[PDB]
């Protein structure tokens, strides 16, 4: 029996440095986790001990911290090269800076094959990108070979910025011919590595004949066999076993997100590339594992430009930006307005005759706003100032909510109004009126929202059964601040850019900002 | 007796081409007027016939049409050089593009002296600008000499962009020492040429001993002796005679604006530079005077880059920009909102602890809006598209209005509502509610306006006695659309940038716009 050890990461999302336990800035070293230096240590230990090792990444290295802001994927090529990744599948966020922002920093600099079988190019882009990513790669491992076939979420054109000369085909339709092609090269050991989410990964396991193992991403899925080592709650066993339509047992794995774990799966194969068995579990990269000193020092050197950048002027405010709790927890505050205006301004997508913009509405819990910004420093705003206001390392995500759900959110906003609790909502694209003299749960007396299906944006009454796209913090999408109805009733949830990045981009675009308190929220 | 003929222009405001009768785009050639080609013809005729001629400009060549937008004052140097101006005084608008935007295009390229006695520099600017403008110049004319001393409105730092290293001193205080200095050079014939307005010009005539003639600007003053040749109504005789405190008769002249007239004054001087008499009148530059073919052809060559520029993308809209009369004459329309947002965004001036911005409020008569803009041309907006919306060649000006006046304007807005008349107001920085069921004159039921003296902008009720700064079309400032109360009751009026330029600058800044109908105007 020939044994393969698959080490794998997915949705690292620019967590090049070690993080806190919930994947934000590392504050208390003794409780910090992940980062590429620690991952280096663990990979190097395993590669010392085990004969046949592949280190794979299932996409979404791009986007998530100031690393990506400053280095735009050059940090991904550099550190992935240093860790000697064996292959990577493209994810949705690898198109965030467009095709050009993928070809250069990543495709041209990676020292390992980057894979996707279901993306095809045309127009002049076809010539520019030809051969710079591949449907599959056959890799020598020990004395054997392993084929790896890649795939990328077919939703990518709605989520990111691939442009109009890339077509994203159905994953299963695209993969089958490639796997058939591998069979014809006498490749009998096949990994599907790709970035479409656990539910798609299971379908690939079931339906794509010849696939031996699926290594996936995109859904931040945590799989574990046994007691969970940290706070993530498993979505299922590791590996998750799919019974394929050809009656094989196909293991499916993922390793959460943010570089906190190193996926580790051992597969025993017989002479004909059939899986005898497979077992393993993600490894929690906690502080018991030392950060490799060399990679740490290189990280520290790369961090000099980030620190520099963090204190430069992004743009100016001519107004005090009132992020005080005494305002933002009690009434409309102009810092809430700025953040929402920035959320809506980020990622505009228009379709003639269809929508002026795909999203028009924003909500933001006042407790998420953690500082004002003073305008009397020559009006300068820096990334560091924005980090005081938004210090949690979160994202601004897009969800789809029924009107009824959002009406419940706005009742929750004021259900125990007056105690300075964090749940009071700042808004954009929404005009709400409350009457606090009404019973809790019945205080929203007017709730109008900006149309999307219109050529001229205007405000209409919220409709209980209609589904609205809303940008809001990942904190709220996950039901924080007691917004359980959002978590439980949302119909879709896509993760977006890092919170600070969204606001900094808007400020840099606008050059000079002056958000006002203008009657988005009123009390009768 | 030695006779001097002073030809003079002021406040030409970028009217390099011939104009209509009210100084807008020339449509019907047979009724077009001014422009530098026609002015060339007239100046050349007078210089053939009269021995001792100076051609002077009293400032504000900068700003007013796409000429200045594209060529940024290089068109001023070029054409003023071609006409062989003898001297020019700096006006307020010559600082519109900052000190750098004056030094280069104009100061370094003019082939005539540029004058101002009351502007002084310090810091590193003092070294950069030293000698590039002068307090005075002594010019040979025939066998004699004439001293010309310049001055510039002391209000310039509030009106334009001179920066903090220029100090603008009181005009009379500054001029006296210079005129004293000219006396000590045996210069007995002295013209004060400068840019502070007719009322200041009269005070200079009265108070600055040794000044023989004042040639002024800034107030667009039309002076005429006899029947007016066109539609401008004279503010007084030409020349206007001031009796100086030394008991001389000092003629004061101006020649309206926009290059429509050539000021022409003849002064007879005795042996000791005393004015025996003076007489003349501005010459209407109507179509009876041919445009000089050579200057016309040069104008036509310069116009190629303007036409090119006029069809380039300034930026994009993702919304239909509803400038239809059926909207903008009846209710809030998003094109009205865009224009007002652009008016407020233009010329931000902040003072810590004093005001977030000097102005927060805009009104715009719906009849001034003359086209929508369709977003389905790839969202592109061009200068040509903006010229369909704003075709009158007007400016967006700043006035100071009491609350009572503005409440009267808003009653006028709806006094005969429902007939699609042009006076209905689009707004910015104002939340108005009307109740059309009330009697005319009593229909405004709520009128809230954005504070200026505040660090966080918010809306407060309008106060009848308080004075508000409002940006609005020069059309309205002059009482158009029956807004007689604005003309009659305003406390101050400063003329700003060309209407199209203001909107194009904003669109270029924003890159992608999406103005909404959002409840700035409501009906109860
Ligand atoms: N990642 C996080 C963590 C906390 N919060 C918010 C929830 C509460 O509104 C506030 C913390 O409550 P308090 O400031 O009252 O301790 O922070 C947030 O928005 N995002
Ligand atoms: N320089 C000008 C000339 C006209 N108008 C406005 C006044 C009226 O609102 C409209 C002309 O009225 P109508 O379109 O009903 O003829 O144009 C303007 O705003 N500026
Ligand atoms: Ca196999
Ligand atoms: Ca004299
Ligand atoms: Zn991801
Ligand atoms: Zn993803
Ligand atoms: Zn002027
Ligand atoms: Zn002026």
Swiss-Prot record, chains A, B:
Output the Gene Ontology terms for molecular function. Answer: 5'-deoxynucleotidase activity; 5'-nucleotidase activity; GMP 5'-nucleotidase activity; identical protein binding; IMP 5'-nucleotidase activity; nucleotide binding; thymidylate 5'-phosphatase activity; zinc ion binding
Positions of AMP binding:
329, 365, 370, 392, 475, 481
- Which residues are recorded as binding Zn(2+) 2? 11, 60, 92, 195, 218
What residues are glycosylation sites in this protein? 28, 286, 308, 378
Q: Which keywords does this chain's UniProt record carry?
A: Cell membrane, Disease variant, Disulfide bond, Glycoprotein, GPI-anchor, Hydrolase, Lipoprotein, Membrane, Metal-binding, Nucleotide-binding, Signal, Zinc
Which Cys-Cys disulphide bridges does the record give?
26-32, 328-333, 340-362, 451-454
Regarding activators and inhibitors, the annotation says: Inhibited by adenosine 5'-(alpha,beta-methylene)-diphosphate (AMPCP).
Q: Which GO terms describe its cellular component?
A: cell surface; cytosol; external side of plasma membrane; extracellular exosome; membrane; nucleoplasm; plasma membrane
Annotated residues that bind Zn(2+) 1 are located at 11, 13, 60
Provide the E.C. number(s) assigned to this enzyme.
Answer: 3.1.3.35, 3.1.3.5, 3.1.3.89, 3.1.3.91
Binding-site list for IMP:
329, 365, 370, 392, 475, 481
Catalyzed reactions: a ribonucleoside 5'-phosphate + H2O = a ribonucleoside + phosphate; a 2'-deoxyribonucleoside 5'-phosphate + H2O = a 2'-deoxyribonucleoside + phosphate; dTMP + H2O = thymidine + phosphate; CMP + H2O = cytidine + phosphate
* Disorder named in the UniProt entry: Calcification of joints and arteries: A condition characterized by adult-onset calcification of the lower extremity arteries, including the iliac, femoral and tibial arteries, and hand and foot capsule joints. Age of onset has been reported as early as the second decade of life, usually involving intense joint pain or calcification in the hands.
- Describe its assembly: Homodimer.
PANTHER family listed in its UniProt record = 5'-NUCLEOTIDASE, 5'-NUCLEOTIDASE-RELATED
- Function recorded in the entry: Catalyzes the hydrolysis of nucleotide monophosphates, releasing inorganic phosphate and the corresponding nucleoside, with AMP being the preferred substrate. Shows a preference for ribonucleotide monophosphates over their equivalent deoxyribose forms. Other substrates include IMP, UMP, GMP, CMP, dAMP, dCMP, dTMP, NAD and NMN.
**Full protein name:** 5'-nucleotidase
The gene from which this protein is expressed is NT5E
